[PDB]
Design a protein around this nucleic acid. Structure first.
Lengths: 82, 205, 80, 86, 148
RNA sequence: AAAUUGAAGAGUUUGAUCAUGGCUCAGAUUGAACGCUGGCGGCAGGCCUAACACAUGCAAGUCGAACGGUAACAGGAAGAAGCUUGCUUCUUUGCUGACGAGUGGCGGACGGGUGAGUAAUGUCUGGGAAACUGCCUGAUGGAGGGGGAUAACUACUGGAAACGGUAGCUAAUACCGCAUAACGUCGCAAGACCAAAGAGGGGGACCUUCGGGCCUCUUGCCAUCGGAUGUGCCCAGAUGGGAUUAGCUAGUAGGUGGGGUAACGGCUCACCUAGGCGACGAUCCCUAGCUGGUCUGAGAGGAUGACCAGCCACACUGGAACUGAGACACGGUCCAGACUCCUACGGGAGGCAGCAGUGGGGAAUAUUGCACAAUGGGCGCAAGCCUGAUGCAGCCAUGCCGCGUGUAUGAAGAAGGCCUUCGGGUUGUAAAGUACUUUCAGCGGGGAGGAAGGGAGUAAAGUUAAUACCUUUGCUCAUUGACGUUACCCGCAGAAGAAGCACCGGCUAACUCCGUGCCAGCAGCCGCGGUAAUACGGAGGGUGCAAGCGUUAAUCGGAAUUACUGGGCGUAAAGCGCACGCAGGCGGUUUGUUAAGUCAGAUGUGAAAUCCCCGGGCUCAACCUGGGAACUGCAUCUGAUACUGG
């Protein structure tokens, strides 16, 4: 079905994830429906590192989109941050 | 990746002192400064328009210790940048760390300063920078790191420095062996027998 | 919301069908001259009320035959 | 087939094929009886035949042997024609 | 491990011992067929493994240069040896042959025996000895000059 | 705030000139190759040829929480004993942790490869209406009572193998009736008709046939109407060349009716009408996957479609359908062909354009590697299992970027070489000497991050008869990295291990001697070579590049040399020998009308990435990344009416 997950861009040894809503069958870095956040695991954390359009994430869940283990974590982490 | 051969040859070919030695000596007592290298140095070049453009670009490159590829990329960036391209080229050169290390007097030559940089003797903002072409920014503080502070090269380097004209845009504390890149130098700060527009002409044709 | 085309009847021979030509001017992509282009459409004319030469208003609809995806809305001018 | 499950799938699809074939052949039979009555001009035989056919085109739809729409057309079509005669 | 045989170099893809299709390790005693070399080496020679392949590339190419230099050297001598524009007598008529054997050991060995049957009257010479099978450029080689 | 705010010419026809006109050069670019040379690193790239053929491994499984179950290993047990009396080995029995083979479910239609075919059941832009749509999701109700089978297994038997033959026998969420049946299907309506399946976790009175009932929650099953995603279909414009191809067409174009599809439709059939296409290029022939974009160019253009992403098409060749929500199926089935492998000769088996690897072709393109730790996919309640997707590592200077191969001092300025009018000049502060530094490579020492989760306990809430279980959220404890000898930091030794390539006649930066003598040879263009050759070859000197440098190949540029922007035809290439004239292009002047062209505005769309602008992160840079701007285009609606068209 439709799922919200991380498409891994960035460079070798320097991962950078683009959070995307997509048909789960399409390849990880392939066709998606909507971009909805990003996630830098290598951010200096002096400034940002994790940004989620929670309004559109929820909208898609409301219409049955599932959510990665890793995005489900980010959302709990970001909800905690503020 | 570096020019390693005889240095005064370069000065002799370009017709000027390129400061490739400390300055302890009148350059004319070290070489025949006013004559090109080689069998036919006495010969005069009835020099084409292309020729004067080439030699001027070589001159600047040989001053800063930059080979063609990197220097061309410097032109490209100067061009892309806003404002006069010729002046932008010299800002970029003059912002190099090996260069700044030289201007604060930590190295007798840009070659010596470059070695200081490469050999992890220089810090920027208390952080070790060891690549020569590192672009230095306003308000940065470059310093000799503690362990390199007792090197006699550095003391001598600061002495000679005190005898050169003192650059405006740098605040140097000789005791601490730290210094501050206050601002980008203006054009007016830099020598006036550099003809950037010739270099600009060479790279647009 | 009534998207529509206007053109003239070049053939009325077929039973309940018609051929309509839509002509327009178009700027030439390279040489700038304005060129006539024509689009011929097989259209549905139940009742065959459209005569050749007529000027008619047509609309797009579902497939009616291998080549008909348009039907008649109404006649505008006739029998010049 | 080469893969373990591929082998198994070919076996299962053949079983299903013979299952579907059997039920499908049955169904068309009961459809054909109605068209045959129609072509002989009998209301009753054709209505009777339609009543036997109804529950089974419906059921085979529910069972995925055919889609709901197919079942409907058959009922629509036959119903149209039988009424048009008696 | 990188292995270098003669002027040929390469990494070993797999190892085969007699009937055994795969062997993990091979000792100084038991022989093991080597695989993954760039091309078919000489029928026999000294083989030495190296740490890195890059260091062994220049060495392998160096041996080719010497073998090529002597190839052109022996080519110039044989042609100039006659010291005349043609043969002094009527033995000029010759037969050409084209040979490709599956094994490298034979082509060098049997050719020597094939040069034993040579005579002054009719001269026979081998052209383009192959490492194995047959190929387009080989059939083309027999197309230009009539040969078996 | 910023975000296309950008544009060069030189050599060569002549004795010389101007014009004409081609050839040639300076520039960027490349999936490159070859020649000489070659230290390290980061990021990228890597069969362009034979859609040639492929040995071997691996690339699609998973669920015991659907099912009969045990054959392996693991315990456990009445009871056999190891017995040296709590340690135990085996006979047994699925008792259970698990699990081979089997039925069953979901996945094998995704992920990955290729570009053969296709000038259109393709792609791009923009719109339509007649449709289906697993998993996920909202809504409302079902989930009743039965039946006959079958694999496994057992017995007998055929095969070299592949794989079979008989008869037994048995389970289920396999399969089929029967009931129930509307906000479903058919029907004007009256009415008529259609489904299903269990499995687990925990438990208080209560009790039996000790199986469980029953209580409770999770989960799966059926129906119908929706959502979301996916897909099918239709129209218009655009998307290569050729007339040394001008006519093409019988399911052809339309109509009626039957059939058909999930659905509109000549999709199909019968009958009827005689149409339909075409110079605005049909038909036929050649070539080709299309796009975002890429390279070049000031631009307009020109060239192009690797790597990344979107669509399509294909899966040894030709054809076919079966299963399924989805396929006419990349590691499924069937037939035919080409080909290969096994065989005990009777018969069998297979399809790398998945990842490695091999042969072949070629100027030329890598290892039969490590790991599921991370992201993502399949199955499962989970734990987990699978994943040549992916993350990584190896190989190659293939490219981009970074750094090193030392720094400073060092003179009558040595020796040697080279030129010299023998005065000296040069190589050259170059070397030696003198101090000095130690990046990188070497060697030892230490040590981030990519890790989120998952596991035991615990506590609180929602549950409920319940403090169970379940689920959510906090707590503590112990844990999960292929890369890896990671990045990075500290220490040790010594300048120690690290420089080549092309060029120097003009274009074009760089000149002399000796050798040769129209030879040997050079040569991008002009043009060098018969005794002073800065042009051949060596040398010294010099110029330009630098871990590369040259040569070859290749696109665009300069080329205003196909000229839309932006050219020409008296004598330079170019006015048809002349006229008439269909199609076509263009068309005097006024009014009204229209509103297609044209103009304005609004709205939607123009995927992301790329390009550009301002920022952020790796010591810098390449590289990665936030936001913007741009996508100059298309479409709908509403206006304006001067010009063009009606």
């Amino acid at each position: 079905m439709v799922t919200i997950r991380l498409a891994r861009h960035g460079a070798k040894k320097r991962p950078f994830y683009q959070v995307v809503v997509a048909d789960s069958r399409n390849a990880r870095n392939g066709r998606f429906i909507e971009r909805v956040g990003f996630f830098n695991p290598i951010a200096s954390e002096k400034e940002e590192g994790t940004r989620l359009d929670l309004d559109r994430i929820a909208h898609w869940v409301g219409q049955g989109a599932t959510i990665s283990d890793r995005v489900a974590a980010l959302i709990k982490e970001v909800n905690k941050a503020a | 990746a570096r020019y390693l051969g005889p240095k005064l040859k370069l000065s002799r070919r370009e017709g000027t002192d390129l400061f490739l030695k400390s300055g302890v000596r009148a350059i004319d007592t070290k070489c025949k400064i006013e004559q090109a290298p080689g069998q036919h140095g006495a010969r005069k070049p009835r020099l084409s328009d292309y020729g004067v453009q080439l030699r001027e670009k070589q001159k600047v490159r040989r001053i800063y210790g930059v080979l063609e590829r990197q220097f061309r990329n410097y032109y490209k960036e100067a061009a892309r940048l806003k404002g006069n391209t010729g002046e932008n080229l010299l800002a970029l050169l003059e912002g190099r760390l090996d260069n700044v290390v030289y201007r604060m007097g930590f190295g007798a030559t840009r070659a010596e300063a470059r070695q200081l940089v490469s050999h992890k003797a220089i810090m920027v903002n208390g952080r070790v920078v060891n690549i020569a072409s590192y672009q230095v920014s306003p308000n940065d503080v470059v310093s000799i790191r503690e362990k390199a502070k007792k090197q006699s090269r550095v003391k001598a380097a600061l002495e000679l420095a005190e005898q050169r004209e003192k650059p405006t845009w740098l605040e140097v504390d000789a005791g601490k062996m730290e210094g501050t890149f206050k601002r980008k130098p203006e054009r007016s700060d830099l020598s006036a027998d550099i003809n950037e527009h010739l270099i600009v002409e060479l790279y647009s044709k | 919301k009534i998207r529509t085309l206007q053109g003239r009847v070049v053939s009325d021979k077929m039973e309940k069908s018609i051929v309509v030509a839509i002509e327009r001017f178009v700027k030439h992509p390279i040489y700038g001259k304005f060129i006539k282009r024509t689009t011929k459409l097989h259209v549905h004319d139940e009742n065959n009320e459209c005569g050749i030469g007529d000027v008619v208003e047509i609309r797009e609809c579902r497939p009616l035959s291998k080549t008909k995806s348009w039907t008649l809305v109404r006649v505008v001018e006739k029998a010049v | 087939a080469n893969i373990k499950s591929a082998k198994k799938r070919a076996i299962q699809s053949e079983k299903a094929r013979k299952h579907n074939a059997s039920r499908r052949s049955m169904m068309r039979t009961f459809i054909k009886k109605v068209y045959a009555a129609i072509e002989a001009g009998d209301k009753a035989a054709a209505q009777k035949a339609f009543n036997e056919m109804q529950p089974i085109v419906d059921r085979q739809a529910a069972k995925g042997l055919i889609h709901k729409n197919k079942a409907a057309r058959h009922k629509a079509n036959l119903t149209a024609q039988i009424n048009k005669l008696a | 491990d990188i292995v270098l045989c003669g002027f040929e170099y390469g990494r070993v893809r797999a190892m085969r011992n007699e009937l055994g299709q795969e062997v993990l390790e091979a000792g100084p005693s038991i022989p093991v067929e080597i695989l993954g070399l760039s091309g078919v080496p000489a029928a026999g020679d000294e083989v030495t493994v190296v740490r890195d392949e890059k260091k062994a590339r220049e060495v392998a190419l160096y041996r080719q240069g010497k073998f090529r230099e002597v190839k052109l050297a022996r080519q110039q001598k044989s042609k100039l040896e006659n010291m005349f524009a043609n043969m002094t007598e009527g033995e000029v008529h010759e037969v050409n042959i084209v040979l490709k054997a599956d094994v490298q050991g034979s082509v060098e060995a049997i050719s020597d025996s094939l040069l034993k049957l040579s005579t002054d009257e009719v001269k026979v010479k081998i052209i383009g000895s192959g490492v194995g099978g047959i190929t387009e450029t080989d059939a083309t080689l027999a197309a230009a000059s009539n040969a078996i």
